[PDB]
């Protein structure tokens, strides 16, 4: 994988159409767009998410467990790899799958309540402490690996847990068997165990992803690259591992690429403070020897409303941020999401700051 890495992060929800001929034209336009961009890598959505409801009910590949909305992942992948000149990473949820109801869901323990619950504002995650969950998610990854060819796996940012999670029974048993003492509420507020507990959960998530990676590699070979999305707070504010169960140093050690969600508006940063926020983030990375060499800075090309009516970020703004990264010594970056239907971001405005091939 020759450097710098320049990544387009792409949803196939945009490509899908009930009319097959329209879908064909859509795929053709997408392939040409990526070819024209002249960058290195596409992170390609393997699951359907038309509603942004934080739960995958259908996917883009044949498989044993979930409905296939359309057989298009493998078709788009091989064309991008041979016509558009890019590596392809299959972008897959780690936990947020709409599987058999008897599979354990991640739960949290509400303050002042005795029974654990599922928080409506989080990804609808299955518990990584349930071995049946590990097996069935494993099956989905094996099914993708069997039917499509690709160069890497991008593990979704839904591999996270808060400081009130996971409160489910198998998680409780796992903590007990690992030597943790007391209820979840006692552990999280125990000065002598709460840090160990956060790290235990971070390692549990990472180990689960490495298990999934091993299953794919058994099928497609050892050459498969791994990437995982990490939230910005665990990078800039490491104590936040306590409520993310993500550890930046761990990601750097465990994956070929750590894809940092360098998205200031997502993080609630004001428009006039976003540049400084990005400079602070990149300064933090550069202070960790060779972190920049294994990290991708992923910029946002939309401003999301937890409601659902997302707003585009201007092409000029995105190009400005890409320029900012380069001027601050960062060579590996990309953006999410791409919208081929509307040329958003505008390829002519983005290319000179994004493609090394630009003249």
Ligand X SMILES: CC(=O)N[C@@H]1[C@@H](O)[C@H](O)[C@@H](CO[C@@H]2O[C@H](CO[C@@H]3O[C@H](CO[C@@H]4O[C@H](CO)[C@@H](O)[C@H](O)[C@H]4NC(C)=O)[C@@H](O)[C@H](O)[C@H]3NC(C)=O)[C@@H](O)[C@H](O)[C@H]2NC(C)=O)O[C@H]1O
Choose which of 233, 269, 288, 349 interacts with ligand X (CB under 6 A): 233
| Minimum distance of ligand X from residue 128's CB (angstroms) | 19
Per CB under 6 A, does 58 bind ligand X? no
Per CB under 6 A, does 169 bind ligand X? no
| Minimum distance of ligand X from residue 330's CB (angstroms) | 20
| Minimum distance of ligand X from residue 139's CB (angstroms) | 29
Indicate the helix (H) or strand (E) that contains 30: helix 20-37
User: Among 54, 224, 27, which residue's Cα sits nearest to residue 141?
Assistant: 224
Choose which of 73, 91, 141, 231 interacts with ligand X (CB under 6 A): 231
Choose which of 23, 31, 266, 279 interacts with ligand X (CB under 6 A): 266
- Distance (Å, whole) CA 244 – CA 137: 21
Per CB under 6 A, does 267 bind ligand X? yes
28, 38, 76, 188, 342 from 35: Cα distances, Å: 11, 6, 13, 50, 17
User: Closest CB to ligand X among 252 and 262?
Assistant: 262
| Minimum distance of ligand X from residue 189's CB (angstroms) | 10
Per CB under 6 A, does 321 bind ligand X? no
**Residue 80 CB contacts under 8 Å (≥ 6 apart), including other chains:** 31, 34, 42, 44, 86, 88
- Intra-chain end-to-end CA distance of the chain, in Å: 22
Q: What letters, b where the CB count within 10 A reaches 16 and e where it falls short, cover 89-126?
A: bbbbbbbbbbbeeebbbbbbbeeeeeebeeeeebbbbb
Tokens 């601050």, located at residue: 328
Per CB under 6 A, does 210 bind ligand X? no
User: Closest CB to ligand X among 122 and 343?
Assistant: 122
| Minimum distance of ligand X from residue 244's CB (angstroms) | 7
User: Closest CB to ligand X among 240 and 315?
Assistant: 240
Choose which of 63, 87, 122, 162 interacts with ligand X (CB under 6 A): 162
Per CB under 6 A, does 163 bind ligand X? yes
Choose which of 14, 16, 194, 243 interacts with ligand X (CB under 6 A): 243
Asked if 321 and 279 touch (Cβ cutoff 8 Å), the reply is no
Per CB under 6 A, does 31 bind ligand X? no
User: Closest CB to ligand X among 78 and 243?
Assistant: 243
Per CB under 6 A, does 355 bind ligand X? no
Q: Treating both helix axes as pointing N-terminal to C-terminal, what angle do 20-37 and 347-354 enclose, rounded to 10 degrees?
A: 40
Q: Name the residues that contact ligand X, by CB under 6 A.
A: 162-163, 231, 233, 243, 266-267
């Amino acid at each position: 994988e020759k450097s710098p890495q320049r990544i387009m992060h792409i949803d196939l929800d945009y490509v899908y159409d009930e009319n097959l001929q329209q879908m064909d034209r859509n795929i053709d336009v997408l392939i040409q767009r990526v070819k024209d961009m002249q960058i290195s890598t596409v992170y390609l959505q393997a699951f359907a998410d038309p509603d942004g409801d934080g739960l995958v009910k259908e996917v883009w590949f044949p498989n044993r467990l979930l409905p296939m909305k359309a057989d298009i992942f493998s078709r788009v992948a091989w064309q991008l790899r041979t016509r558009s000149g890019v590596n392809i990473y299959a972008w897959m949820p780690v936990l947020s799958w709409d599987l058999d109801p008897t599979l354990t869901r991640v739960k949290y323990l509400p303050t002042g309540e005795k029974k654990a619950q599922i928080h409506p504002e989080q990804y609808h995650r299955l518990s990584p402490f349930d071995d049946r969950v590990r097996a069935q998610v494993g099956m989905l990854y094996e099914d993708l690996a069997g039917h499509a060819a690709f160069d890497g796996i991008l593990f979704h940012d839904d591999a996270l847990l808060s400081d009130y999670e996971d409160a489910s029974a198998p998680a409780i048993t796992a903590y007990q068997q690992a030597g943790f003492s007391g209820s979840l509420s006692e552990i999280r507020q125990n000065p002598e165990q709460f840090k160990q507990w956060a790290r235990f959960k971070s390692r549990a998530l990472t180990d689960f992803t490495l298990e999934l990676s091993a299953r794919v590699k058994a099928i497609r070979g050892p050459h498969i690259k791994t990437a995982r999305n990490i939230f910005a707070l665990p990078v800039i504010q490491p104590e936040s591992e306590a409520w993310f169960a993500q550890n930046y140093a761990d990601f750097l050690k465990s994956y070929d690429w750590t894809a940092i969600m360098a998205m200031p508006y997502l993080e609630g940063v004001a428009e006039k403070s976003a540049d400084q926020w990005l400079i602070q983030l990149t300064n933090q990375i550069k202070n960790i020897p060779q972190a920049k060499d294994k990290s991708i800075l992923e910029l946002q090309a939309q401003n999301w409303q937890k409601n659902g009516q997302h707003q585009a970020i201007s092409s000029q703004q995105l190009a400005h941020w890409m320029s900012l990264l380069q001027l601050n010594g960062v060579k590996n970056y990309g953006y999410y999401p791409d919208n081929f239907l509307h040329n958003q971001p505008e390829i002519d405005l983005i290319r000179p700051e994004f493609s090394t091939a630009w003249y």
